[model samples]
Target: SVSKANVPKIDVSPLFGDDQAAKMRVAQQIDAASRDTGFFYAVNHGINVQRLSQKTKEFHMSITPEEKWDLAIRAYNKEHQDQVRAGYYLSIPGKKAVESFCYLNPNFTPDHPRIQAKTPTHEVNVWPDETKHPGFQDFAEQYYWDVFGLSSALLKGYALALGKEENFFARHFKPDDTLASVVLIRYPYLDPYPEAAIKTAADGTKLSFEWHEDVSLITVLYQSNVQNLQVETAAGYQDIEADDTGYLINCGSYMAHLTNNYYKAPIHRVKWVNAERQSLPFFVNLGYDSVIDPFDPREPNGKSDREPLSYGDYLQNGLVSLINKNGQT
Candidate 1:
C-alpha cells in the first residue's frame, strides 16, 4: 500500500545514496510529515536490512526471570556490578510474552564536565543477567551506537528540511554535547487468548492503548512484524504503512519546541498488541544543559501555557505522569 497523506512515507536510502539533492527531497517530505501527522516512515536505509534481521533472530529471548537488587550495592558499592550474586531486572512472571526494555546510556565519567555540573538522566543502566543472556549487552550496544550515528545524520536531514543550515542540529548536538537514548522493545503477543486491549467504538473498532505524544526531538522506530502501530489523525487512526513503508520517524515534542511551534510532536500508540511485535526506537534528545530558546515565548509544542522549563525539570514531571498512567507511583 502507498503512504497515506495523513502520514507520509518514503524510502530513506537516497539520503545516503547517490543523489546530491537527496536531502532536499527528504527535507520536503519531512516538512509535510511535521505539519501533517507528525509521523513518517523511512524505507531503504543504506544499512544492511537483511543482516539486521539475522542479528535480531540470534537474540535469545526464552527467559527465566528474577528480581533486581535495585542498587543493592552501589559503591561503598561502586555500581550494580557485584558480579556473581542474586540481582536482576525481570519478574519471573510466568514467562512474560509482552514488553521488554533495553536502555542504552552513553558513557560519561564522573570527571566529565556534565557529570561535574550534575546532569539529570545520566544514571547507570542495569543489564540483564549475563549468564542467561550472554552477548546481549554486547550486541545491543553495538546496535545502539550504530543507530545513534544514524540519528545524527538524520538530524542533518531535518536541518535541511527545516530550511536551516545543514549542520544546524548537528552543531548543537556535538559528540561532547548531545545525548541519545536508545530503547530496544520486544513486544510480544499479549493475548494468545481473548479480550482486546482497547475499548470498542461505535463503528466497530477499538482505540489502542492510550493517546500520548513523544517528548523527545525525534523517534526512529524499526518495526519487526506485528500490527496496530498507527498514528492518530483528525479523522481518527491512520495507517503508518510501516511494514512496506519502512522504519518510522516521528516528530517529538522537543523538536517541536525547538522549532517554535512550526512542527509538532506526533501522538501515537500500539493498538491491540494482541500479536507479537518488535521495535527499536531511537530518541534524539537534547545535550546536557542544552537550552531551548524560542523567542516566541510559546514552546514549540504550542500546547503549554506554563513558563518554559529546564529539560531536567520538564522530564521529571513527565516521567512521573507516565508512571502514574501505568498505574504505578
Candidate 2:
C-alpha cells in the first residue's frame, strides 16, 4: 500500500493528537508517500479551506492591475534595496498568464531586529493599506499561522518517518524564526495563446508555470479550480487529483538535500488550463541560521563528511538563480 498510481489521501488527524501509537501510524503512511510518490493528500488536517478559498478570491478580485503594479516587489522594494524578498512576480511579466503574491512569515514585525538588519527572508511584508483591502491582511495572517501549525506537526511525522526521534526537527524550527512563505498564485485562462507560442515541456505538455520543484523543505498546496498539476514518474508525467477539503503535500529540494534523496523531490508542473485558476501554496522552512547536512539514519553517531551549510545561504542561492533565470537582476 506504500506506492500508488494515484496519490494517496491520508487522514493526518493523528498527527495533531496526543496518542503516540496513532501518531506513528500516520507517520508510517507519510513515510510511504514520501518514499514512493513523493506527494500525498492530507485530510483531516484542521484548516478551513472553503473560508480560505473565499478570502483568496476576494483579495484577487478587489485588487486592480494598477494597484498590483504599485504593490509589486520591484516597486515596493525600491527603497529597501538591501532586503531580498519578492512580494509579487510573473513568469513572464507582460504575458500575464501566471502571477503570484509571495509573503514571508507574518510574525516578522517591522521593528524586529532582523528586519532592522535587513535580513534576506526577514524583510517586512508589503500589503495594501488595511483600509483599502479591509480584512485581507487579517485573513492572510490567520491563514499563515493555520498552515504553519499543520506544517510544524507534519515535520514531526517526517522525522519519525526518517527514523529520527519525534523532536528531531524541533531545534531548527522556532515559530518566530522560521522562514516559511505563503504564495497566492493566479493562472489566467490559456485560451488566447496561439498554438505556436505555447511552450511545451520535454514531456510534451503545455506548461503554464513551467516544470520545476520548490526549494522549501515541503510545499503544502491548495488549488481552487481544475487540477492542472502533473508529476513526473517512471511511466511519464501523471495528473495529480485535486481535493477540495485537503492539501496536496510534496517534498522540496531542501528536504531532498537533507535526506540525501531518500525522499524524492518530485518534479511537477502546471499544465495550461482553459479556465482561470487560483492556488495557495505554503513553503514550510527552517530557521534561516539552521545548518543542515545529509541525514544518515543508519549512522548512530550521525556525522557527515560534507561541509554543513546554513539554510539561509541555500535559499539565497536558489533565489539568485531564479532572478538570473527570469532575466532580472
Candidate 3:
C-alpha cells in the first residue's frame, strides 16, 4: 500500500565549515539515513533552488515536445552513427510524459585523450544550439558545476560516516574527468491521468520508471514543489515531500556495491499525478577509470575479495542492461 513518510531532513552546513566536531555530527546523521532509508533531504548544501526552477522552466518551455524527442539519444545515435553523448530519453518508447536530457562532464572535448580512446561515459555533452535555445547551455553548465561541488562535499560526509578520513573518496574524483551526469526531467500534467499513459513492463506490471534505482554513487535530486516522488520501504511505498531549500539525496547502486549493501540503494519512482512537474537529478559518479572494489564502511579498513571492476565498463554495462530491461533496443 502507498503511504507518506518524512524522509530524513539533514542540514549539511557543517560540511563546508572548518569545525570537525560539527561536521562529524552531521556525518552521523547522514550515516543513520544511509543505513536506515538510504535517502535524506540535504539542506544548505548551497545551490539556488529558486534559480533552478526558473532555468528548468525556461528550457522545458523553450522547446516543443516534438523537438525534444528529435534530440533523443536513441534518435541521434541512429541518425549520426555516433555516440558523442547521451541526450533526451523517454522512459517508454513513443511516450512523452517522462522525458529528460542527460549531460556528462562538460570538460570533454573531441580532441581529448579520453574522447579519442572512446572511454564510456567520457563523451562530450549533447546540447541544443545556443542561438536557438538562449541561456539553456549556460544554465546547464553552471548547474552541473554547482552540483559537482555539492557532491564533493557530500562524499566527504560519507567518508567521515564510514570511519575513514574526510578526504578518503576525494582522489577518485577529478574536476574535469568525473563521470557525473546531470539530468533535467519533465513530467507533464496528464489530465484525467489517462489509463493509456500506463505502460507494461517485461514483468507484466505497469511500468514507467515505476520502481527504479539510479546507477550512481549518490544522486542529488531537486523536485519542483510537487509531491510525486516516493520510496519503497519496509512498510510500503511512501511519498517523499519536497522542501524548497533542500535537495533529496539518495544512495545508488555504486554506493551499495562499494559498501557491500551496508549503505543500501533504495528503490524509488515518480508517481503519476494530475499536475505537471519537473525534476533535476545530479548523478554523482567516480572518475571514469576509477576501480570499484567492495569495502566495508563500518570497519576502519575492511574490503572483500571481489576482483576490482573498472567504473567505465561498469557504467557502460549498466546502461545497456537498463535499455534491455525496459524493452528498448
How do the residues 174-252 of candidate 1 rate in per-residue lDDT, one tens digit apiece? 5555556655445555534244334454445554445677757788777775656666678676666546236678877
TM-score of each: 0.76, 0.90, 0.90
Candidate 3: regions farther than 4 A off = 65-70, 75-77, 90-94, 192-194, 199-207, 298-301, 327-329
Evaluation by TM-score, superior candidate among 1 and 3: 3
Candidate 1: worst-modelled 10 consecutive residues by lDDT: 83-92
Off by over 4 Å in 1: 1-5, 14-20, 49-60, 67-97, 109-118, 129-131, 190-208, 295-310, 326-329
lDDT of 2 by residue, 1-329 (tens): 11224689989888887999998998899989987778899999899999988888888767777666566775344754533564665345445456678888877887877777877767778787788789998899889989988887888888888888877775687777888888888766655654543557875677666667777888888996587788878867788877878899998888877876778799887777767778889987888899866775546776544466688887878767755653332
Ranking by lDDT: 2, 3, 1
Model 2 residue 39 CA deviation in Å: 0.4
Cα RMSD to the true fold for all candidates: 5.8, 3.2, 2.9
CA lDDT, every model vs. true structure: 0.58, 0.77, 0.76
Report how far residue 206 has shifted in candidate 2, in Å. 0.6
Candidate 3 TM-score over all chains jointly: 0.90
Please count the clashing residue pairs in each candidate, in the order shown. Answer: 4, 0, 0
User: Clashes in model 2: which pairs?
Assistant: none
